Design an enzyme around this catalytic site. Structure first.
Site, PDB file in Angstrom:
ATOM      1  N   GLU A 112      41.397  33.114  35.239  1.00 46.18           N
ATOM      2  CA  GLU A 112      40.302  32.305  35.534  1.00 46.18           C
ATOM      3  C   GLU A 112      39.218  32.807  34.567  1.00 46.18           C
ATOM      4  OE1 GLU A 112      38.031  33.589  38.985  1.00 46.18           O
ATOM      5  OE2 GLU A 112      37.346  31.490  39.820  1.00 46.18           O
ATOM      6  N   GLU A 205      28.296  27.731  39.661  1.00 42.43           N
ATOM      7  CA  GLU A 205      28.883  28.515  40.873  1.00 42.43           C
ATOM      8  C   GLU A 205      27.712  29.552  41.320  1.00 42.43           C
ATOM      9  OE1 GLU A 205      32.318  30.859  39.850  1.00 42.43           O
ATOM     10  OE2 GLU A 205      32.240  32.050  41.763  1.00 42.43           O
TER      11      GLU A 205
END
Length: 228
Positions: A112, A205
């Protein structure tokens, strides 16, 4: 000129779709995903790539738009990639951590990755983002701190463990072009190998390890592309 022209003209255009559950899709030719582990959240995605985000009582919330690939080619095999973005912050609360910039995954290795130009948290993410601090580097004409981590949690493969790669901009940027592949080049020099690419998207995010974070954010410009 100090800034890109889209910084002066960015406006949501095209058709749109509102999503309020975890959902992967496309609008026009733009890939999107809303994902959260919890909370009462939404995102609105436009066919010009731009989007907007809302989150309420979320532990980890991601709103993202851009490229979705099939995990068959490395970034170098795909080509040189960039993202143009403009972020407009709005109110938020109890945001324990946040990342704004470019995001995605690879497979083989499972990674990620983050290129973080801004954040919705009161302060930037710190050294806690990873176990390995590679240090400060000039990447894409600016200073970034590069980190690597190994994390356990939800992933594109299910609940497992994966590496994380981070570039964190030392001074926030709210509008410009991220030279994505320039970060990948730097990471390769540091042993942070990219696998077969799953996605490359503009991201907002926000989360809280204990809290639920709440707030909203706007991305009046967001375009990810393979090109100069």
């Amino acid at each position: 000129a100090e800034f890109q022209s889209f910084c002066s003209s960015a406006s949501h255009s095209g058709q749109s779709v509102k999503v309020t559950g975890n959902k992967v899709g496309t609008i026009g030719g733009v890939g999107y995903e809303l994902w959260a582990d919890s909370g009462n959240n939404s995102a609105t995605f436009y066919s010009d790539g731009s989007f907007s985000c809302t989150f309420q009582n979320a532990g980890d919330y991601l709103c993202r738009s851009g490229l979705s690939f099939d995990s068959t080619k490395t970034p170098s095999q795909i080509g040189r990639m960039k993202a143009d973005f403009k972020l407009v912050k709005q109110n938020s609360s109890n945001v324990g951590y946040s990342y704004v910039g470019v995001y995605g995954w690879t497979r083989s290795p499972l990674v990620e990755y983050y290129i973080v130009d801004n954040w919705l948290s009161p302060f930037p993410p710190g050294d806690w983002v990873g176990n390995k601090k590679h240090g400060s580097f000039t990447i894409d004409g600016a200073q970034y701190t590069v980190y690597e981590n190994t994390r356990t949690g939800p992933s594109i493969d299910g609940d497992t463990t994966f590496n994380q790669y981070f570039s964190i901009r030392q001074q926030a940027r709210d509008c410009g072009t991220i030279d994505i592949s320039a970060h990948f080049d730097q990471w390769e020099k540091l042993g942070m190998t990219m696998g077969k690419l799953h996605e490359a998207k503009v991201l907002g995010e926000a989360g809280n390890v204990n809290g639920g974070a709440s707030g909203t954010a706007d991305f009046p410009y967001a375009k990810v592309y393979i090109g100069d």
